[PDB]
Each structure stands twice: as structure tokens, then as C-alpha cells.
Amino acid sequence: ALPDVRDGLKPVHRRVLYAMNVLGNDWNKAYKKSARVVGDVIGKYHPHGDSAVYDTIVRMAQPFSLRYMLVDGQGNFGSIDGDSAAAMRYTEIRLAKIAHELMADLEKETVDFVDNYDGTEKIPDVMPTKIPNLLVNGSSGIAATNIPPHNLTEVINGCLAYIDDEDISIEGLMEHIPGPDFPTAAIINGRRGIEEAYRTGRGKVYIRARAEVEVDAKTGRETIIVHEIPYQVNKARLIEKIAELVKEKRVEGISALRDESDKDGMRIVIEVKRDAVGEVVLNNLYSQTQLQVSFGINMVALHHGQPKIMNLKDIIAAFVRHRREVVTRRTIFELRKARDRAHILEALAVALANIDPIIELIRHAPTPAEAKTALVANPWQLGNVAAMLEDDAARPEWLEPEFGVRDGLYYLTEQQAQAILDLRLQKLTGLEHEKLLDEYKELLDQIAELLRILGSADRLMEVIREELELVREQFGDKRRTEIT
Amino acid sequence: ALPDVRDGLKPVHRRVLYAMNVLGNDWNKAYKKSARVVGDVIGKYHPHGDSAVYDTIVRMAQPFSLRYMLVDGQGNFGSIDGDSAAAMRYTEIRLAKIAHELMADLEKETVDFVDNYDGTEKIPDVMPTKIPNLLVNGSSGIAATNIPPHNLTEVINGCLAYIDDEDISIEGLMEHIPGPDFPTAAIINGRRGIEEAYRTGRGKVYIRARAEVEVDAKTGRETIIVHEIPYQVNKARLIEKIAELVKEKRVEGISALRDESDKDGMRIVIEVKRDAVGEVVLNNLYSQTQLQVSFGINMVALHHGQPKIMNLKDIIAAFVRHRREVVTRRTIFELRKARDRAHILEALAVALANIDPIIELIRHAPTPAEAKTALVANPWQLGNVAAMLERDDAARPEWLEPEFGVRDGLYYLTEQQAQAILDLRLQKLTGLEHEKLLDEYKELLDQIAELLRILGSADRLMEVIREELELVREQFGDKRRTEIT
């Protein structure tokens, strides 16, 4: 599958993250065993093999795999030497903080949902992401796409620059986004390959290990130290290949080879023979090993449901258009939700102002259906809530004109009558009664504010911008990969 | 793992069935995709490989594997030829009706629960089963136990005969349970091996295919037809072994071999050469192939947490003792639950009889806490529910202190009763809803009296147990399949 251009996710990734969200497997709550999330995914969303689901989770937790990890893992999640993760019953996971930004406002009718595999559950078609995840975490797929990861600060600055100037050039965007940024650091060589990829969607660059020749001050002997290796290279396999080249005499001048890497960092030590030149040995290692690799940037993603080759500007534009859709839908949802709640609260307020006749009516009703019928049959006096209740701004858009406040009287709907019948006796106490009235007044202010936002293109675009700025403050970090 | 003697299950089976129960994957509801159950099991109860969990589900659904299937499956669940089941996202399952009897009263504090693997969930240690599942479905394990399956009517009869007479002999039990009964029918040969296994826990019997020699009336040519094969034999493997023996000339006289089995039944056809004798060919096949197999009965199960070799009476006695424990626990639970509910209903009835002062009190309380305080501070007149409430003390919860409840024509509420009043919805004031609460109270008083009779009498307890076993026999008992010779 190709990633969606808007959230950077393939279905399997989206299913995992959604399952974690539904479970409440939050960044600020206790870790859960990986098996619990796997079992949920398998059962409800991705019924295709515990090991493939668990592999997805593992990869999302590994700091050498994802530039911004989506899963916060505790335990053994494998290594850059290709060691396996521990079994899913042993490792523990929760959502990374940044994953919550990928899923912000999911409950606010911001994205379309589709059926799961058996038609018993709903799954988001795309996440309502505040993070430009496709660019920052990248994607690959060989069945094809190959998008490298990027620095979040840089990409947010590029998004804001596009919002400021929709005609910005690729050169203009590259002042903010000079190239990829790998979790594994190292060096990118080929500035024109970057530019070609950003302009056209395709370009080839080379990634090189950070390695130096050291000279021992007392003896003059040379040692090559490798500090950082290219993205997606397996360190153990790299060291084995070097040993094989030394054995076959395809690379000369190496007296010893040792991995001294540990928890604190990578350190591959290659000692140079006294009669060899360190720089020459190192150059031969770059030409014959994965100390240098090519990376064919191929920026293909799903856009309006179809596979598309996309340039840097196309990708940014799609993300920003997604934010516009999300924020507009979210604000419409909040307005609807507030109007619906205010509508119920009007009924409860009117009922509580008429508590004596309401009780009398209900007590003498043979059944709840007959009580509901009696509640809606005649309108109610407003009493001391007249001023509070008497703009049509708070009325739900679906409410017919025969209902609500009309000439000093309240005409209830059957659903309002049901809300009255559902009122608990404890709502008659002073504090509970007052809380309902206060909530109504707050909702009126919230409705007015939401209408001001929906009425103003400037307000809406500002909400989009400010959300991007906040992401940069909360999650932006330093560049790791040097571009040459 | 060894199965528990009481429910016949190993942990993995118990975790699967419990997950289905918790999901509401009931016999009378829509089928669910197998993957849904597998995912629940992996997540909460058995975090060890989707294929192993699914393999357990699948076996529990196969009519050639289980004498009484515990899972009702729809879709391809494999075959007697060893075909694999379809993938878990394309098969559908729910609990078999009889599985609900295995788990009857699980929600009634009838069995101990233990922690799952991560300490976040509880799992029953054993099922509160109304079915003697160890005997009827059997068990095997090689890491050792080997218990064949048995006919449920027969086994229930044996249980009832033990209840009637605790000193019944093995011979007495065998009048009801003459031997094993395989899902796959066929024939058992070795009556003394059965008796040895029932008396001691161990004995060897032989299982033989049902096969006949047919003669063609017009031509005289003979054909062997195999109708039924021994339990746990793979039909395809059997046919291959026969072909190999014919090829190597270790069995002579066979001109053709064909599997003509289909949906309607098994039919393996072995044509006999004109110059060979059918009966002689068939006897040679019984001596060299799985048309006949041994079955080493080895009745080992977990009893009071330890492995032990158990004879037929030991197993029956353990099942009946389990029923006594389950029914006693269930009755205690139901009594507590009914008293707790009756206690809440008294409060609601008294409040509804005092609706005007109750409303005045609440309206003038600043908060729900202060309303609760006011409700409990002083007692309430009983009004028209005096007769209903006063009438024993039989309905009082055992934990209720004497300062509470009905006292000298007045009702003294607890804080929890007051909370129940404050939680009442306005719709409960209607005539119908009010009447339903009063009717429920009166039903509870009758239920309480009946539960007290059970707890007060060992005879009444055993009568409950006996009647439950009789009902299982009536609902699920079926005909014997395997012929004993």
C-alpha cells in the first residue's frame, strides 16, 4: 500500500494507532503490554498475523527507524545490528506524545470513517493530523515509494512559508527545508539530487557515514573511527562485509576491526597498518561498502485516492488543505454540539422552573410514553428563566420553527421531554440546578465565538497557523544529518 | 498441561471459551469472525501466537474431533483428510449451545478467578460446568494423558447412579457407561481393556474401522468398502499407506483403491483382484494399517492442583463434588444479590410513598451530599407500603446493622439507599414504572425463601443437582455411535 499524502500512514499504521487511541493507551498513562494492543488490532482492524502487526509496532518505536517515534516503547525493541525485539507479551508500549497530535480531534467529525473488515466497527480513512507526518517520518514500499524523513522544525517553517505565499517557489521552500534529516544522522552528499527530488518528486542522493582518521600522538599509528552510518544500514552486516573484504584482500591496509559501540553511542574502530595510509583505506571503504549508499528519492503517495508522484510543494499544499478541511469541520462540529446541548439545557431549565407542575404531570402519567405526550401537548411558562432564554443563534439548524421559545412560552420536542424524564432527583438540588444554568450561559458565549470564527477567513487561517507554530514549539528539535 | 478433572479443560481452551463468553458470542446471536475472538484471546488471556489460539478454536468446532463440539463454526474448518481451516478473518464462530452449560453461572461467584498474564484481567481457574466434559469430550497430551470421549446420556446416567448410591461399584457404573463413544463411530474391540481402564485408570483397547466385503451379483467380483475409521486417523494418510503397501507388495490382492467419500458420508473403495479372497485382503489390511489402532487409555488429570491417575468412579465423584460446590456458591451469591436488591427496592418504595416531602427536602438541599445527609438523618413513614414491608427479617442483608431498615413502623435509610433515591430518574414516578418496582420486590421475597430452603437442606441441594443433570440429559443427550465388541 502507498501512504496517504495527508497523514503519511498506510492502513496498517493507521489501524495500530487508532487501536491505541481507542484503548486509551495514552502518553501519560501506564504502559500496556504490546500483546494487548496486538490482540485489539488483530480482532477489530487488521486480521492478518500477530507478527506483522507486532513488527509495525516495533518499527514505530525504534529511534533508529523513525525520525519522530509514534510509539513510546519500554523493553527490548531490537537494535541497529538487527537483533529481534522481545516477544509481545514482554514489551510495553503507549502512544508517543507526538502521536496524539496525529490524532487530535478524531472525535470531532473531522475525518471520514470507513467500515472495518467485517462491518462491525468504524476506522478513520485518514488521521486529522497536526503533524506533516509523511515528510517528517518518510515512507518506503517496494511492491513503489521512497520518501526520506525530514526535520519537523524545518517542515513546519516550510508550511508556514507556503501559507504566507501560495506562489512560493521550490527554491523559496528550500530556504526552510534544505533536505532530508535521518534519525541516524550521517551526511548527505548531492545537493542537486535533493533539489531535483523536491522539484520533480524524483532524485538520487548519496548518504555517507561520518568517519574520521585519528593519529596516535605517541606512535603515529592511524585509526578510522566510524561515528554514524547511513539510514537503514545494519551495523553488524556492515562490519561483516568489511571483514570479508579484508579476508579477500579487496581492501588492504586494515590491521584490526572492532565494534566498540554501546548504549552511549556508535563507535566502529578500524585500525590501519603502519605501511598504509588511513585516508586511502577509508576512501576504499566508501567505494566498496555501505559506508556510502544511494537513496533514490521517489515521492509517491495517495492523493484523492490515486497514486501520484508529488513534488515538495504538492506535498505541503496537500497537508495545508487537509488542515483547512479538519479545522473547518471541527469548528462546525463544535457549533453543532454546543447548539444541541444548549437545546437540551433549555428544556431542563424550563422544567426546573416549573418543577411542581412537572412532578404532578409525571406522577399522574400511567407510563413514560403518556408523560412525554403530556409534556409536549402544551407549552410551558418560562418563569425566572425568561431573561436567560429570550438571537436565534443557539437554535439547532435541524429544529423546526414550531419548537422552542415562542411568544413567552416554551414548546418542547419529544427528545427534550425524554431528557426531562431522564433527569435524576439530585439535579433538583441548588448547586446542581445552578451548574446547569451556568453551563447554558457558557454555551451561548462559546456559540457566539464559534460563529465569529466561521464567519471570518482570517480567523480560521489563524487557527491553522497557530496550531503549526505550536507543534514547532512543542516537538521541533535539532537537525541531525549534515547536508553537503 | 493436564486437563482439570472438573471441567476437562486445559488453560488454553478455558481462555478461548471465557473470551467468547465475555464477548457475548452466544449460541443465539449472530456469528462473529474468528479473528475477533482470536484477537481478544491474544490480547487479554493467551499472548502466544494467533495460529495456536486459532488451532484451538478450530479443533473445538470440528465434528470429527469433538464428541460434543464446544464451538459452532460456519465456513471451512478443515477435514478428516487433514485440510487446513480457512484463515481466521474468513471463518465465523459462536458458542455451541452445550458450551453455555459448561459456563453456566460463571457470573455468580461459583469458581475462583486468577490473574491473567499482565495482572489487568481475571480468568476463571475452572469452569462451573453442568457437563462432565472430561469424560464426554476426552483429552490427550504427550508432554501424559489419554482419555477417550464418551456418550453424554451414558455419562449423566452414571453420575445419577453415583448420586443415588455413593458405594456403587465400577461394575455398577458400567451398566450405565459400557465404554467410550467416538465422534467418528467405528468399533471398539477389547471389553476387558475397558474394564481395566475404568477400574485402574489405565487399559489398552483397539479401535477398528467398519468395513465390509461386497460381492457383485452379476460378476462375482469382490470390493471392500470402508464406512467408518478409527478416531484420530487421517483418511488421506490411511489411503496413502495402503497404496504404499500395495506398491511394495506387502499387501497383495488389491486391483484398485479410490476415495468416494463426499458430503453424504465416508466411502473408501478397495477393489479385490479376481484371484484373491476379499476377507483375507481385509484381514491383512487390519493387521498392517490404521484400519485398526491401539488406544492406550491413561486417565490422568489435575485433581486438587496435582496430577493424578483416576479411575472412572474417581472422575465421576470429582464432577459431582464440583457440582455441590458450584451450586452451594451460586445459592449463596444469589441470596446476597437478592437481599441487596430488595434492600434498595425498600428505599425506593418508601421514597415513592413519601414523594412530596422527599422533593421538598431535595429542593432545599444545596448539594447532593447535604440531601443525602437530610434523607438519612430522620426516619420515614411507610404509608401504603407498610404491609408489603413489615409482613421475618429474611430479606435483610447480613451486613446491615440493626439501626437501619424497618423499625417500629418507620424506615431508617442508609447512605447508599439515600444515594439510590437521589439517582432515581423522574420517569420512575409514573404508574407503570412505580408498579414494576413493587412487583420486583415481591418476586424477590419469594426467591429469597426458596434459596434459604436450598441452603438449609443437603437433600434439597442434591435435588437441585440431580434435576440439572436430568435436564442436561434431556436437552443434549444423543445416541451412541461406536459399537463395543
PDB file of N, CA, C and O in Angstrom, chain B residues 83-125:
ATOM      1  N   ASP B  83      -6.994 -31.358   5.849  1.00  0.00           N
ATOM      2  CA  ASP B  83      -7.025 -29.997   5.236  1.00  0.00           C
ATOM      3  C   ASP B  83      -6.993 -28.931   6.305  1.00  0.00           C
ATOM      4  O   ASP B  83      -7.617 -29.087   7.340  1.00  0.00           O
ATOM      5  N   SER B  84      -6.286 -27.833   6.060  1.00  0.00           N
ATOM      6  CA  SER B  84      -6.302 -26.720   6.988  1.00  0.00           C
ATOM      7  C   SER B  84      -7.669 -25.971   6.960  1.00  0.00           C
ATOM      8  O   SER B  84      -8.322 -25.902   5.963  1.00  0.00           O
ATOM      9  N   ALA B  85      -8.009 -25.352   8.060  1.00  0.00           N
ATOM     10  CA  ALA B  85      -9.114 -24.403   8.094  1.00  0.00           C
ATOM     11  C   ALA B  85      -8.779 -23.140   7.231  1.00  0.00           C
ATOM     12  O   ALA B  85      -7.636 -22.869   6.938  1.00  0.00           O
ATOM     13  N   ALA B  86      -9.804 -22.447   6.740  1.00  0.00           N
ATOM     14  CA  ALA B  86      -9.629 -21.156   6.106  1.00  0.00           C
ATOM     15  C   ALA B  86      -9.061 -20.139   7.128  1.00  0.00           C
ATOM     16  O   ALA B  86      -9.198 -20.344   8.343  1.00  0.00           O
ATOM     17  N   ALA B  87      -8.494 -19.065   6.635  1.00  0.00           N
ATOM     18  CA  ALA B  87      -7.955 -18.020   7.510  1.00  0.00           C
ATOM     19  C   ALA B  87      -9.013 -17.493   8.455  1.00  0.00           C
ATOM     20  O   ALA B  87     -10.214 -17.417   8.136  1.00  0.00           O
ATOM     21  N   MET B  88      -8.563 -17.095   9.648  1.00  0.00           N
ATOM     22  CA  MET B  88      -9.432 -16.591  10.717  1.00  0.00           C
ATOM     23  C   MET B  88     -10.267 -15.375  10.394  1.00  0.00           C
ATOM     24  O   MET B  88     -11.352 -15.195  10.979  1.00  0.00           O
ATOM     25  N   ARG B  89      -9.874 -14.565   9.432  1.00  0.00           N
ATOM     26  CA  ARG B  89     -10.744 -13.484   9.033  1.00  0.00           C
ATOM     27  C   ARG B  89     -11.925 -13.922   8.123  1.00  0.00           C
ATOM     28  O   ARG B  89     -12.807 -13.098   7.874  1.00  0.00           O
ATOM     29  N   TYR B  90     -11.937 -15.154   7.668  1.00  0.00           N
ATOM     30  CA  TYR B  90     -12.992 -15.674   6.775  1.00  0.00           C
ATOM     31  C   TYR B  90     -13.807 -16.849   7.327  1.00  0.00           C
ATOM     32  O   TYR B  90     -14.461 -17.563   6.526  1.00  0.00           O
ATOM     33  N   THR B  91     -13.590 -17.221   8.572  1.00  0.00           N
ATOM     34  CA  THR B  91     -14.487 -18.156   9.264  1.00  0.00           C
ATOM     35  C   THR B  91     -15.236 -17.404  10.340  1.00  0.00           C
ATOM     36  O   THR B  91     -14.811 -16.325  10.816  1.00  0.00           O
ATOM     37  N   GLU B  92     -16.327 -17.963  10.758  1.00  0.00           N
ATOM     38  CA  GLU B  92     -17.249 -17.313  11.701  1.00  0.00           C
ATOM     39  C   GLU B  92     -17.607 -18.333  12.798  1.00  0.00           C
ATOM     40  O   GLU B  92     -17.750 -19.524  12.509  1.00  0.00           O
ATOM     41  N   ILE B  93     -17.758 -17.848  14.039  1.00  0.00           N
ATOM     42  CA  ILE B  93     -17.956 -18.706  15.174  1.00  0.00           C
ATOM     43  C   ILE B  93     -18.927 -18.092  16.168  1.00  0.00           C
ATOM     44  O   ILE B  93     -19.100 -16.878  16.233  1.00  0.00           O
ATOM     45  N   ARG B  94     -19.496 -18.976  16.962  1.00  0.00           N
ATOM     46  CA  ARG B  94     -20.146 -18.631  18.230  1.00  0.00           C
ATOM     47  C   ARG B  94     -20.134 -19.852  19.131  1.00  0.00           C
ATOM     48  O   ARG B  94     -19.723 -20.954  18.736  1.00  0.00           O
ATOM     49  N   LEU B  95     -20.509 -19.664  20.375  1.00  0.00           N
ATOM     50  CA  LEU B  95     -20.507 -20.765  21.331  1.00  0.00           C
ATOM     51  C   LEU B  95     -21.558 -21.775  20.922  1.00  0.00           C
ATOM     52  O   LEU B  95     -22.662 -21.424  20.524  1.00  0.00           O
ATOM     53  N   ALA B  96     -21.212 -23.027  21.029  1.00  0.00           N
ATOM     54  CA  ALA B  96     -22.204 -24.076  20.878  1.00  0.00           C
ATOM     55  C   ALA B  96     -23.166 -23.960  22.054  1.00  0.00           C
ATOM     56  O   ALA B  96     -22.772 -23.562  23.163  1.00  0.00           O
ATOM     57  N   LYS B  97     -24.370 -24.445  21.876  1.00  0.00           N
ATOM     58  CA  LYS B  97     -25.354 -24.424  22.986  1.00  0.00           C
ATOM     59  C   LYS B  97     -24.838 -25.126  24.239  1.00  0.00           C
ATOM     60  O   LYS B  97     -25.014 -24.646  25.348  1.00  0.00           O
ATOM     61  N   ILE B  98     -24.161 -26.261  24.049  1.00  0.00           N
ATOM     62  CA  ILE B  98     -23.643 -27.010  25.153  1.00  0.00           C
ATOM     63  C   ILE B  98     -22.511 -26.300  25.866  1.00  0.00           C
ATOM     64  O   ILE B  98     -22.331 -26.487  27.048  1.00  0.00           O
ATOM     65  N   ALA B  99     -21.765 -25.407  25.172  1.00  0.00           N
ATOM     66  CA  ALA B  99     -20.744 -24.640  25.824  1.00  0.00           C
ATOM     67  C   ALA B  99     -21.303 -23.694  26.900  1.00  0.00           C
ATOM     68  O   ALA B  99     -20.597 -23.355  27.857  1.00  0.00           O
ATOM     69  N   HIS B 100     -22.507 -23.218  26.694  1.00  0.00           N
ATOM     70  CA  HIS B 100     -23.185 -22.358  27.675  1.00  0.00           C
ATOM     71  C   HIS B 100     -23.449 -23.116  28.957  1.00  0.00           C
ATOM     72  O   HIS B 100     -23.442 -22.514  30.039  1.00  0.00           O
ATOM     73  N   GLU B 101     -23.618 -24.426  28.853  1.00  0.00           N
ATOM     74  CA  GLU B 101     -23.763 -25.260  30.040  1.00  0.00           C
ATOM     75  C   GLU B 101     -22.445 -25.486  30.762  1.00  0.00           C
ATOM     76  O   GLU B 101     -22.410 -25.634  31.990  1.00  0.00           O
ATOM     77  N   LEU B 102     -21.353 -25.524  30.014  1.00  0.00           N
ATOM     78  CA  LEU B 102     -20.035 -25.574  30.591  1.00  0.00           C
ATOM     79  C   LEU B 102     -19.729 -24.341  31.419  1.00  0.00           C
ATOM     80  O   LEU B 102     -19.018 -24.400  32.426  1.00  0.00           O
ATOM     81  N   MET B 103     -20.311 -23.203  31.028  1.00  0.00           N
ATOM     82  CA  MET B 103     -20.025 -21.951  31.677  1.00  0.00           C
ATOM     83  C   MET B 103     -21.211 -21.393  32.457  1.00  0.00           C
ATOM     84  O   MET B 103     -21.198 -20.224  32.819  1.00  0.00           O
ATOM     85  N   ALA B 104     -22.210 -22.226  32.717  1.00  0.00           N
ATOM     86  CA  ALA B 104     -23.408 -21.754  33.411  1.00  0.00           C
ATOM     87  C   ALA B 104     -23.047 -21.179  34.793  1.00  0.00           C
ATOM     88  O   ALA B 104     -22.292 -21.805  35.530  1.00  0.00           O
ATOM     89  N   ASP B 105     -23.575 -20.009  35.117  1.00  0.00           N
ATOM     90  CA  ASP B 105     -23.383 -19.391  36.437  1.00  0.00           C
ATOM     91  C   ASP B 105     -21.964 -18.903  36.736  1.00  0.00           C
ATOM     92  O   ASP B 105     -21.607 -18.636  37.889  1.00  0.00           O
ATOM     93  N   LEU B 106     -21.177 -18.692  35.689  1.00  0.00           N
ATOM     94  CA  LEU B 106     -19.849 -18.114  35.843  1.00  0.00           C
ATOM     95  C   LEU B 106     -19.866 -16.725  36.508  1.00  0.00           C
ATOM     96  O   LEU B 106     -18.958 -16.337  37.247  1.00  0.00           O
ATOM     97  N   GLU B 107     -20.929 -15.978  36.275  1.00  0.00           N
ATOM     98  CA  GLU B 107     -21.060 -14.627  36.826  1.00  0.00           C
ATOM     99  C   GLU B 107     -21.570 -14.622  38.280  1.00  0.00           C
ATOM    100  O   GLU B 107     -21.843 -13.562  38.850  1.00  0.00           O
ATOM    101  N   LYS B 108     -21.726 -15.803  38.879  1.00  0.00           N
ATOM    102  CA  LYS B 108     -22.323 -15.933  40.193  1.00  0.00           C
ATOM    103  C   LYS B 108     -21.371 -16.409  41.282  1.00  0.00           C
ATOM    104  O   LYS B 108     -21.795 -17.057  42.238  1.00  0.00           O
ATOM    105  N   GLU B 109     -20.098 -16.033  41.158  1.00  0.00           N
ATOM    106  CA  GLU B 109     -19.090 -16.299  42.187  1.00  0.00           C
ATOM    107  C   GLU B 109     -19.054 -17.808  42.555  1.00  0.00           C
ATOM    108  O   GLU B 109     -18.978 -18.202  43.716  1.00  0.00           O
ATOM    109  N   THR B 110     -19.147 -18.615  41.522  1.00  0.00           N
ATOM    110  CA  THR B 110     -19.168 -20.060  41.639  1.00  0.00           C
ATOM    111  C   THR B 110     -17.787 -20.722  41.530  1.00  0.00           C
ATOM    112  O   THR B 110     -17.620 -21.853  41.991  1.00  0.00           O
ATOM    113  N   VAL B 111     -16.825 -20.009  40.925  1.00  0.00           N
ATOM    114  CA  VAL B 111     -15.463 -20.501  40.768  1.00  0.00           C
ATOM    115  C   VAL B 111     -14.452 -19.402  41.134  1.00  0.00           C
ATOM    116  O   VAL B 111     -14.755 -18.212  41.038  1.00  0.00           O
ATOM    117  N   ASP B 112     -13.258 -19.814  41.522  1.00  0.00           N
ATOM    118  CA  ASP B 112     -12.197 -18.879  41.810  1.00  0.00           C
ATOM    119  C   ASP B 112     -11.642 -18.341  40.486  1.00  0.00           C
ATOM    120  O   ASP B 112     -11.589 -19.050  39.481  1.00  0.00           O
ATOM    121  N   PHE B 113     -11.259 -17.081  40.499  1.00  0.00           N
ATOM    122  CA  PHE B 113     -10.613 -16.436  39.349  1.00  0.00           C
ATOM    123  C   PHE B 113      -9.129 -16.184  39.688  1.00  0.00           C
ATOM    124  O   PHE B 113      -8.792 -15.978  40.866  1.00  0.00           O
ATOM    125  N   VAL B 114      -8.273 -16.199  38.665  1.00  0.00           N
ATOM    126  CA  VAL B 114      -6.872 -15.903  38.816  1.00  0.00           C
ATOM    127  C   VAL B 114      -6.488 -14.763  37.867  1.00  0.00           C
ATOM    128  O   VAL B 114      -7.218 -14.473  36.942  1.00  0.00           O
ATOM    129  N   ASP B 115      -5.337 -14.161  38.118  1.00  0.00           N
ATOM    130  CA  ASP B 115      -4.823 -13.079  37.267  1.00  0.00           C
ATOM    131  C   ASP B 115      -4.441 -13.618  35.892  1.00  0.00           C
ATOM    132  O   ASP B 115      -3.964 -14.741  35.737  1.00  0.00           O
ATOM    133  N   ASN B 116      -4.669 -12.802  34.881  1.00  0.00           N
ATOM    134  CA  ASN B 116      -4.094 -13.067  33.573  1.00  0.00           C
ATOM    135  C   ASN B 116      -2.597 -12.713  33.567  1.00  0.00           C
ATOM    136  O   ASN B 116      -2.007 -12.324  34.613  1.00  0.00           O
ATOM    137  N   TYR B 117      -1.964 -12.793  32.401  1.00  0.00           N
ATOM    138  CA  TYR B 117      -0.506 -12.645  32.310  1.00  0.00           C
ATOM    139  C   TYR B 117       0.050 -11.293  32.740  1.00  0.00           C
ATOM    140  O   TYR B 117       1.184 -11.213  33.190  1.00  0.00           O
ATOM    141  N   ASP B 118      -0.725 -10.229  32.600  1.00  0.00           N
ATOM    142  CA  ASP B 118      -0.230  -8.936  32.976  1.00  0.00           C
ATOM    143  C   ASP B 118      -0.883  -8.327  34.212  1.00  0.00           C
ATOM    144  O   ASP B 118      -0.586  -7.183  34.530  1.00  0.00           O
ATOM    145  N   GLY B 119      -1.726  -9.091  34.918  1.00  0.00           N
ATOM    146  CA  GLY B 119      -2.397  -8.588  36.131  1.00  0.00           C
ATOM    147  C   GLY B 119      -3.511  -7.570  35.893  1.00  0.00           C
ATOM    148  O   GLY B 119      -3.937  -6.928  36.833  1.00  0.00           O
ATOM    149  N   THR B 120      -3.976  -7.402  34.660  1.00  0.00           N
ATOM    150  CA  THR B 120      -5.006  -6.428  34.353  1.00  0.00           C
ATOM    151  C   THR B 120      -6.392  -7.043  34.175  1.00  0.00           C
ATOM    152  O   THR B 120      -7.369  -6.305  34.099  1.00  0.00           O
ATOM    153  N   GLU B 121      -6.484  -8.381  34.093  1.00  0.00           N
ATOM    154  CA  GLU B 121      -7.751  -9.076  33.869  1.00  0.00           C
ATOM    155  C   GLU B 121      -7.801 -10.320  34.785  1.00  0.00           C
ATOM    156  O   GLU B 121      -6.779 -10.775  35.293  1.00  0.00           O
ATOM    157  N   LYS B 122      -9.002 -10.827  35.007  1.00  0.00           N
ATOM    158  CA  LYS B 122      -9.222 -12.076  35.770  1.00  0.00           C
ATOM    159  C   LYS B 122      -9.714 -13.164  34.811  1.00  0.00           C
ATOM    160  O   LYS B 122     -10.314 -12.881  33.748  1.00  0.00           O
ATOM    161  N   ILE B 123      -9.371 -14.401  35.133  1.00  0.00           N
ATOM    162  CA  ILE B 123      -9.720 -15.540  34.310  1.00  0.00           C
ATOM    163  C   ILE B 123     -10.200 -16.644  35.288  1.00  0.00           C
ATOM    164  O   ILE B 123      -9.566 -16.832  36.325  1.00  0.00           O
ATOM    165  N   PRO B 124     -11.271 -17.360  34.945  1.00  0.00           N
ATOM    166  CA  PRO B 124     -11.648 -18.477  35.845  1.00  0.00           C
ATOM    167  C   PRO B 124     -10.575 -19.545  35.909  1.00  0.00           C
ATOM    168  O   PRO B 124      -9.996 -19.912  34.881  1.00  0.00           O
ATOM    169  N   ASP B 125     -10.351 -20.063  37.094  1.00  0.00           N
ATOM    170  CA  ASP B 125      -9.453 -21.173  37.303  1.00  0.00           C
ATOM    171  C   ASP B 125     -10.029 -22.473  36.746  1.00  0.00           C
ATOM    172  O   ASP B 125      -9.272 -23.386  36.383  1.00  0.00           O
TER     173      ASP B 125
END
